[PDB]
Amino acid sequence: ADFTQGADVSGNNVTLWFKSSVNTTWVDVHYKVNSGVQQNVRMSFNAGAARFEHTILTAAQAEIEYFFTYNNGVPAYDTTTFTYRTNSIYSIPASSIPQPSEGGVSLKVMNGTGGAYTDDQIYWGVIGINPVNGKWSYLDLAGRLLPISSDLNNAPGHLTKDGINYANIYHKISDANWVNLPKIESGRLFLSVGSPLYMKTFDDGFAGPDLNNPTDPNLNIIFDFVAFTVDKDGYHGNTTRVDQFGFPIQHRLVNLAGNYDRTVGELESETRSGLFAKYVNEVPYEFKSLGTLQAPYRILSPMKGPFQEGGAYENYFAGYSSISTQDILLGVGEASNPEVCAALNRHVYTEPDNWNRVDQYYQAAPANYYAKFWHDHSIDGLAYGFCYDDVNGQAAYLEVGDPKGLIVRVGW
Numbered sequence: 001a002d003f004t005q006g007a008d009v010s011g012n013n014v015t016l017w018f019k020s021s022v023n024t025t026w027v028d029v030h031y032k033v034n035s036g037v038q039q040n041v042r043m044s045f046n047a048g049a050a051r052f053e054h055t056i057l058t059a060a061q062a063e064i065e066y067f068f069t070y071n072n073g074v075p076a077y078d079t080t081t082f083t084y085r086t087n088s089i090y091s092i093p094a095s096s097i098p099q100p101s102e103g104g105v106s107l108k109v110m111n112g113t114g115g116a117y118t119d120d121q122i123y124w125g126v127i128g129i130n131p132v133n134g135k136w137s138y139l140d141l142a143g144r145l146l147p148i149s150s151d152l153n154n155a156p157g158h159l160t161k162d163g164i165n166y167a168n169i170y171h172k173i174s175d176a177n178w179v180n181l182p183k184i185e186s187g188r189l190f191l192s193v194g195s196p197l198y199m200k201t202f203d204d205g206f207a208g209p210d211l212n213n214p215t216d217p218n219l220n221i222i223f224d225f226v227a228f229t230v231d232k233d234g235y236h237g238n239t240t241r242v243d244q245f246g247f248p249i250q251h252r253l254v255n256l257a258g259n260y261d262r263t264v265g266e267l268e269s270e271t272r273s274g275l276f277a278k279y280v281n282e283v284p285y286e287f288k289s290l291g292t293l294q295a296p297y298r299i300l301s302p303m304k305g306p307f308q309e310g311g312a313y314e315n316y317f318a319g320y321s322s323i324s325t326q327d328i329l330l331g332v333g334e335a336s337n338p339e340v341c342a343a344l345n346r347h348v349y350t351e352p353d354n355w356n357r358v359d360q361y362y363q364a365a366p367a368n369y370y371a372k373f374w375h376d377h378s379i380d381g382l383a384y385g386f387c388y389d390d391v392n393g394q395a396a397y398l399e400v401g402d403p404k405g406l407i408v409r410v411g412w
């Protein structure tokens with residue numbers, strides 16, 4: 001008659017839930033709040049979560065004693081009495097992932113902020129190219145890629161900030177448990193806390209946040225994103241700190257055959273405030289302001305800071321190679337070759353025998369210590385700290401040919 005049960009807390013409310021693994025079509029919950037009149041409620045079935053739920057208002061502060069009556073076939077059964085009063089990305093059972101449709105992947109955006117934000121305060125949006133017709137599109141909750149356009153910015157329901165209209169392509173975590181992510185080219189899953197992002201869409205693309213612009217509408221918004229392509233060869237995706245860090249993210253990919261289940265991202269035990277505080281202590285002086293200039297919204301990548309052309313540290317790599325600091329940090333020009341770029345960022349360039357020896361990376365200056373930071377505080381030391389961190393398999397990148405589920409957790 002097995003079941004799992006629990007009490008989800010959100011704001012001042014407590015949602016009792018009952019998930020049956022048997023032949024159950026109805027569930028009554030019987031509860032007492034600080035020993036009051038016994039409430040007996042026929043619970044509602046939440047299809048997305050595949051569980052019965054009943055929300056008790058303004059009771060998060062209270063003591064709740066509850067048990068359930070449920071059927072298993074014809075007869076009814078009672079559970080024992082439970083009492084109120086993990087959230088880990090690993091706690092989502094693979095068995096609970098719904099089968100994706102049309103060669104897609106089931107996507108869950110999960111709230112891991114430990115009470116910092118509620119589900120209805122975390123926003124997400126998927127934008128990318130639909131390979132069906134090559135049209136730039138956004139994902140709806142039905143799993144459909146809808147074409148974006150300039151008109152979308154002004155369509156009914158559009159967003160507005162300081163008198164300017166922006167496409168409303170975003171959803172709240174509270175809007176869905178799972179969404180089908182169909183095949184998509186250069187997709188991005190934008191994530192933001194407190195508000196959506198404000199990004200102009202066009203008939204042939206969109207303009208994202210410009211962290212070099214003092215008046216960018218997203219400068220004072222805490223956001224991040226995951227990148228993915230879903231094609232005939234399956235799911236391929238990553239988190240990235242190549243441009244900025246907004247908040248901890250974990251990215252778990254699970255396959256159909258049941259032999260692939262991998263997760264990359266910041267360690268779940270790292271806190272956002274922890275990371276800002278450690279960043280300014282751990283990195284050498286030249287990299288410190290990357291963590292302060294646009295605090296508390298983000299930590300900046302070096303080329304968005306004083307390592308840029310004309311900046312105070314525009315010659316940070318000067319003695320080490322003849323190749324410019326800017327070429328190195330962005331993997332362009334004389335550092336367009338991935339292995340060269342990688343070795344320079346890691347300070348192993350002058351020792352070819354060490355290019356693929358992880359324990360020798362970042363052992364002397366000058367080096368990309370911003371990139372090093374993300375490796376030090378990420379699962380399995382994997383991170384996209386700079387553009388070519390995938391050299392020697394060091395990036396927070398995952399792929400599988402038969403994807404079932406992708407879980408993306410917003411940490412804090």
Ligand SMILES: OC[C@H]1O[C@@H](O[C@@H]2[C@@H](O)[C@H](O[C@@H]3[C@@H](O)[C@H](O[C@@H]4[C@@H](O)[C@H](O[C@@H]5[C@@H](O)[C@H](O)O[C@H](CO)[C@H]5O)O[C@H](CO)[C@H]4O)O[C@H](CO)[C@H]3O)O[C@H](CO)[C@H]2O)[C@H](O)[C@@H](O)[C@@H]1O
Nearest residue numbers: 185186187188226227228229240242243329330331332387
């Ligand atoms: O790095 C310095 C420059 O950074 C730029 O901004 C970055 C921006 O370009 C990047 O956008 C991501 C897209 O590049 C990415 O699109 C994917 C392709 O990268 C990729 O091709 C592979 C290729 O990697 C390999 O070499 O050969 C394969 C042969 O087929 C090929 O498949 O193909 C993918 C499959 O189509 C394609 O999706 O998509 C991502 C989203 O999914 C984008 O995030 O993102 C960076 C981080 O945000 C940006 O820094 C600047 O524009 C430049 O000025 C800088 O010099």
Ligand SMILES: OC[C@H]1O[C@@H](O[C@@H]2[C@@H](O)[C@H](O[C@@H]3[C@@H](O)[C@H](O[C@@H]4[C@@H](O)[C@H](O)O[C@H](CO)[C@H]4O)O[C@H](CO)[C@H]3O)O[C@H](CO)[C@H]2O)[C@H](O)[C@@H](O)[C@@H]1O
Nearest residue numbers: 186227228229231233236237238240242330331332384387
């Ligand atoms: O300046 C150096 C270069 O930096 C480039 O930006 C990279 C960006 O390219 C990288 O995007 C990844 C892709 O690497 C990844 O590609 C997959 C292939 O690796 C695989 O073999 O094929 C599959 C298709 O089946 C591809 O998906 O795909 C993911 C998901 O879309 C992308 O996120 O990510 C880096 C970290 O953000 C980023 O720095 C830039 O694009 C180059 O133009 C530039 O020369």
